[model samples]
Target chain A: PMTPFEAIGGEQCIEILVDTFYSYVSKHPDLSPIFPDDLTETARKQKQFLTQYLGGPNLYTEEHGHPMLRARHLPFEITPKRAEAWLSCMEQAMDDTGVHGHIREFVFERLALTAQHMVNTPN
Target chain B: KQPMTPFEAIGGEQCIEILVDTFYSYVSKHPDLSPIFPDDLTETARKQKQFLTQYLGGPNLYTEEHGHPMLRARHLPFEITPKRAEAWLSCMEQAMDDTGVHGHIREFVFERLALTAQHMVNTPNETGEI
Candidate 1:
């Protein structure tokens, strides 16, 4: 009964993975302007969301209530460039952390889809 | 002169209901793309009506209830090709033609719908999402 959580080495590994992702976000020219000055707030929620997303307890939902990710992110002017920047940063963090194989595939597929919902701009 | 929102120009809340329902009826009947739609368009139409009401500036119904749209992300689970996007626009166009949705509002709505549809093209390198 090893969920994707245990398979990726649980909470500690998730913390490292998300933190590393935000580090890249901090330097990402395409993303930095769009994200807040501090990554600490978003960082914590992301880890909680990922935990439940990967089949662990509903830590995020319980503590913060539903992530309501799309609505919360609606105010930001998300472009194709920015959405992909977020993805690439997350992907790099996953790469850097060495959490791979079946778990990697599962994570990538979900994150890729999640990133798509974050964009809204008029013609 | 005061700025007129598309909602106001199009006769506001009442007409929007008609337009959304008429539009999705075409979407549900489209030959090639009908199969991709939900079995019943009732739910989809309801969501669209609310989203468009806000989008057209009648009221902030969607965000007030659903928060940010996250439209692209929600659509990510599906495969949106150019062909699919075109089929979608074709229906909307016909919906407009059938419903007599003309003038600046028509022009404004179609332009953004087209762009949003194009943005939904999420395949590998075919188009940009968002």
Candidate 2:
């Protein structure tokens, strides 16, 4: 069986999602600060990360060791509110790129958890 | 004042290890979550412990085993949803309760995990863009 990464389309599809997601994040009021102006490097890493994470090329793992989502992000403050903003950007990106069906549902499921996990600011 | 690292606040390496274990126990039980897990979380928990150490600004233990911490792909196997994320949080919440990790440390950890969990979702959603 094809992994979701393969099912959705491989590097091409994930690249679009990465580029699209960061574009939205750049303009987003809340996300701009953390996302920074140049998405060039960040987008690149994200594409790789998603590629491997979704069961495709182990590219992300090849270049990087383990994908420590929370650990690396701790230096910056990530509140639940901020996490929502990040997700919102990606959501819109997916929409713009025509991400739909069971695929979208499944992707958001994990993203939602990850975003929530990014929250460093307590209630 | 600059923010304190969670690793420092939690009283060093041992506590981080303990918390990872505490948190995973809950992840292993929830009805919606349990099925996806492997039989043993032993290794998983160990990795998480190292991962959290770096996240909390301690030593780079995880990188020694793995390298760079690119997590989402590793987690792409199971279907992650908002509901599952909540279930995951419940695990952390319970861990906090048990670990006695108070105040900012608890808040900080939750915030970071929230981001991590959100990134793990691989499926599509019902709602479409307007």
Candidate 3:
């Protein structure tokens, strides 16, 4: 099986993805609110999670227990619009990261699926 | 220079052990964060410590025992409120601070953590609150 490391081009690719993702999210008014006021902590979690997701490491699950993504997200009312905004930001980040075309497409597909899955509200 | 793996940067098993232990100590006690954790913090801590060390590049302890860490599937059970996410991030920040990791490493790690928390956002109505 392809580890996240191999899937996303290993450390170098992950670093680019993370840096680009944050930069885009920070500047995006619609998506920015989702981030904590103090981004330092939030940024770290992103890096760890993406690293693992892309096959670098599994730090998020290791330290924080099961990601329980949907369950953990139950408190917030994520609408379709918000999920789209989040994916938009991520796509921009992926674009900026200069990840290989095939891998980039693959990542986008997965992200879209995740975003669609996260939609808890219709509006 | 060869790129360092997450495991190596985390100082292998011994260091990862400390990081996880310290991180959970803060998480379990945090007013907003503690509720998410299981009642038996001691056992949870031990298991988490072992799990994370492997995740960060030390050993395959988590996979060895629990199989794939099906993160999203497992998280499906709980309600990850914005407040809880923030509190969890706060605890992690404190833990990272206490670890005294190198500057670049610290920055990198924190950035990733924040994004993960953001992704866990389930509700749309209160996106700005937590």
Judged by TM-score, which candidate is best?
Answer: 2
- Point out where model 2 deviates above 4 Å: B1-130
TM-score of chain B of 3: 0.81
CAPRI docking class of candidate 2: incorrect
Chain B TM-scores, listed for every candidate in order, come to 0.88, 0.86, 0.81
Superposing every Cα of model 3 onto the true structure, what RMSD results?
A: 14.9
Against the true structure, whose DockQ is highest? 2
Per-residue lDDT of candidate 1, residues B8-86 (tens digit): 8887887888888898888878875676566778978888989988988878887676555656544544555667788
As for candidate 1, its clashing pairs are: A71-B68, A116-B72, A116-B73, A117-B72, A117-B73
TM-score of each: 0.51, 0.52, 0.48
lDDT of 1 by residue, A1-123 (tens): 246677788999999999999999999998898788999998998888787766666677588743556656779888877888888998899999997887788678667666665567632
Q: Which is better, 1 or 2, measured by lDDT?
A: 1
What docking grade does candidate 1 earn? Answer: incorrect
Ranking by lDDT: 1, 2, 3
Best by lDDT: 1
DockQ of each: 0.04, 0.10, 0.09
Candidate 1 regions with alpha-carbon error over 4 angstroms: A1-123, B124-130
Computed on C-alpha atoms, the DockQ of candidate 2 is 0.10
